[PDB]
Amino acid sequence: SGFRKMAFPSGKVEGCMVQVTCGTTTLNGLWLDDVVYCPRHVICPNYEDLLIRKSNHNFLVQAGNVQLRVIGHSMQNCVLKLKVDTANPKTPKYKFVRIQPGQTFSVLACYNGSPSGVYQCAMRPNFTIKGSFLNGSCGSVGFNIDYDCVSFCYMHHMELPTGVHAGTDLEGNFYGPFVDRQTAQAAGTDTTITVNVLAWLYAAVINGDRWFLNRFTTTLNDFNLVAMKYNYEPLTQDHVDILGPLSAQTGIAVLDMCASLKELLQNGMNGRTILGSALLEDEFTPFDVVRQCSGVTF
Amino acid sequence: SGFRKMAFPSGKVEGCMVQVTCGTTTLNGLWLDDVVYCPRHVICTSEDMLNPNYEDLLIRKSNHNFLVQAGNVQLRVIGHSMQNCVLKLKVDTANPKTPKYKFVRIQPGQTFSVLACYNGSPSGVYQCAMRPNFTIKGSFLNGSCGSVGFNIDYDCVSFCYMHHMELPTGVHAGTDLEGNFYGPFVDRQTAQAAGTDTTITVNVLAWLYAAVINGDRWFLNRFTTTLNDFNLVAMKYNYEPLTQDHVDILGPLSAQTGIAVLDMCASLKELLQNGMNGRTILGSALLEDEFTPFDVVRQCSGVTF
Numbered sequence A: 001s002g003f004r005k006m007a008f009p010s011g012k013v014e015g016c017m018v019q020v021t022c023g024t025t026t027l028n029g030l031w032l033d034d035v036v037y038c039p040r041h042v043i044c045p046n047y048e049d050l051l052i053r054k055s056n057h058n059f060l061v062q063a064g065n066v067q068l069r070v071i072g073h074s075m076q077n078c079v080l081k082l083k084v085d086t087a088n089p090k091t092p093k094y095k096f097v098r099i100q101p102g103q104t105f106s107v108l109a110c111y112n113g114s115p116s117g118v119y120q121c122a123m124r125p126n127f128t129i130k131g132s133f134l135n136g137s138c139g140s141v142g143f144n145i146d147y148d149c150v151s152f153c154y155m156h157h158m159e160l161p162t163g164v165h166a167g168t169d170l171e172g173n174f175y176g177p178f179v180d181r182q183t184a185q186a187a188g189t190d191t192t193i194t195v196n197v198l199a200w201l202y203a204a205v206i207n208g209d210r211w212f213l214n215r216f217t218t219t220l221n222d223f224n225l226v227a228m229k230y231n232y233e234p235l236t237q238d239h240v241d242i243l244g245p246l247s248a249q250t251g252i253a254v255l256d257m258c259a260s261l262k263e264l265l266q267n268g269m270n271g272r273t274i275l276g277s278a279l280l281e282d283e284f285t286p287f288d289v290v291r292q293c294s295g296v297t298f
Numbered sequence B: 001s002g003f004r005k006m007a008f009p010s011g012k013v014e015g016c017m018v019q020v021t022c023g024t025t026t027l028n029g030l031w032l033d034d035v036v037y038c039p040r041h042v043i044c045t046s047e048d049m050l051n052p053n054y055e056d057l058l059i060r061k062s063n064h065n066f067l068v069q070a071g072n073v074q075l076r077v078i079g080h081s082m083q084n085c086v087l088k089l090k091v092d093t094a095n096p097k098t099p100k101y102k103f104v105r106i107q108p109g110q111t112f113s114v115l116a117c118y119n120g121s122p123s124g125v126y127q128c129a130m131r132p133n134f135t136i137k138g139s140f141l142n143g144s145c146g147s148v149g150f151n152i153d154y155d156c157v158s159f160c161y162m163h164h165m166e167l168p169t170g171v172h173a174g175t176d177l178e179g180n181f182y183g184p185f186v187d188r189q190t191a192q193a194a195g196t197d198t199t200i201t202v203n204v205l206a207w208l209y210a211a212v213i214n215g216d217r218w219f220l221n222r223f224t225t226t227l228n229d230f231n232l233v234a235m236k237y238n239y240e241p242l243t244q245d246h247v248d249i250l251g252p253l254s255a256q257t258g259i260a261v262l263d264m265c266a267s268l269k270e271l272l273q274n275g276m277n278g279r280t281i282l283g284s285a286l287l288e289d290e291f292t293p294f295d296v297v298r299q300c301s302g303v304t305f
């Protein structure tokens, strides 16, 4: 029993965090094989013009108490790749993957190449993440684990005026309409991740919370009209198919659960809580609910 | 900016997790130096659990009855002893991944990270607090026994909890790493219940200071309170009494924001009376009590917004 915002064990990622310094800018880097990946703004903009003026020795890379020697450098989109003379002996099995809004991942928050904390979060529909980062956190990474393979999906680049965060995949492509410069940029109006709220309602039923269950069902179109009114993301047939296993485990059809969500949206909770929360939680995917309610290990 | 329920990086603890098997029972163990620590109920059957005589069950065991697996390697048990509700298995190999560590017993209100494991394999990490009723609101399934709680301040791991059981309300009970239970619980499948729980007041106050540091002040008011009047009110809402110790501990956050502790107490009194009125504090519609004054200082900026 119990339901917590759970992150993947961070050890395989901790063994890859290094500190990268260029001039007065210090941030974090990801050391995999003989390459260190970090935000290209460490050289700060005309990034090609700033980069051409740099030599390998201008970049200081520190791994624990050891200095790594930079023997090459190149840029891939908004990521700088520093070729070093030592392959990381702690390099785990890994892949670089680009995630979609609504998908969750673990973040290993670092400062000066040293991991300080780990938390779970989701890529918002507006492509920002509601993280917890201070100055010096740039280069901190987001990831998921599948068996023994780490799938790196996020590298932290900046904080927007509303306190939310923006970054790139490990190939340097931003998530969202953001650029890596100190210009006027704002997060677009956000929406609630509907398939995730439904998954978390199934998790509450599995844990013995059914006060919100009702005898009603709804059509997918009628539910979508109601969802559009409360700034909820549209629910698609793919989302219904993905919720199939949780529907079979609890005996509550997806459209049956959608009618419960409609009633919570139109009437509130009435002083009640679901899984210790007074808000409808949208940062647990259907797969996260199945994993936590099954005990998958790494 | 931002405020999340943040756990310590779990790598130093992952390198200590092993699987311990006794007959048909399999659970998790903590391998530090040449000793594996695990719940003593690994020597029990489901039947034994009603009234187990651990000393009588243990005397019938030899070293080779305990199977310890670290990754894909079998560790050889060369000794065993019982310390309170923990079994200590002496092994022939010191853990090369043993971090710098200490065993610390925590008090209610203290927070810690939990590395949930099954079959000696870590599955997830989450943050939580020792409730005033000595239980933890964890997320544990069958096979998680022996999973540990810890803090990593500096490079030293302070182990504070080892998981032993789930109570009928779905909450969890366990021991410190010397085998002493937190709370009036026993490692028996007997009628046991968590006492009525209360809200950790000093933690809610700390989290209100965190909201002010992050730029939110809608909940403040022009009033102050005496410490006694605050306690007479908060205890009507099942809040723990606030002591002079708690007031002293909140001193640094009070100086950083310019809000006296008894003025923050008046704001809490009003919040309890009025609710949130459709508003949130740090993305929450409830008053959060699983962040300590020390957690707020560690996670928030030193510069108030």
Ligand SMILES: CNC(=O)CN1C[C@@H](C(=O)Nc2cncc3ccccc23)c2cc(Cl)ccc2C1=O
Pocket (backbone or CB within 6 Å): A041, A133, A134, A135, A136, A137, A138, A157, A158, A159, A160, A161, A179, A180, A181, A182, A183, B001
């Ligand atoms: C809030 N930030 C600022 O006022 C200055 N700022 C610096 C930098 C940036 O956001 N870093 C930070 C990252 N995460 C948390 C931060 C908390 C506080 C301060 C800075 C943080 C940055 C990087 C890029 Cl690629 C583009 C723009 C900027 C930028 O505008």
Ligand SMILES: CNC(=O)CN1C[C@@H](C(=O)Nc2cncc3ccccc23)c2cc(Cl)ccc2C1=O
Pocket (backbone or CB within 6 Å): A001, B041, B049, B140, B141, B142, B143, B144, B145, B164, B165, B166, B167, B172, B186, B187, B188, B189, B190
């Ligand atoms: C909920 N418990 C049970 O039905 C059976 N049970 C087995 C065992 C125990 O609680 N293990 C479990 C630990 N954590 C989460 C659990 C989730 C589900 C099932 C078992 C869990 C146990 C250990 C001790 Cl020291 C004392 C009593 C018991 C006991 O009563």
Ligand SMILES: [Cl-]
Pocket (backbone or CB within 6 Å): B105, B106, B107, B110
């Ligand atoms: Cl303590």
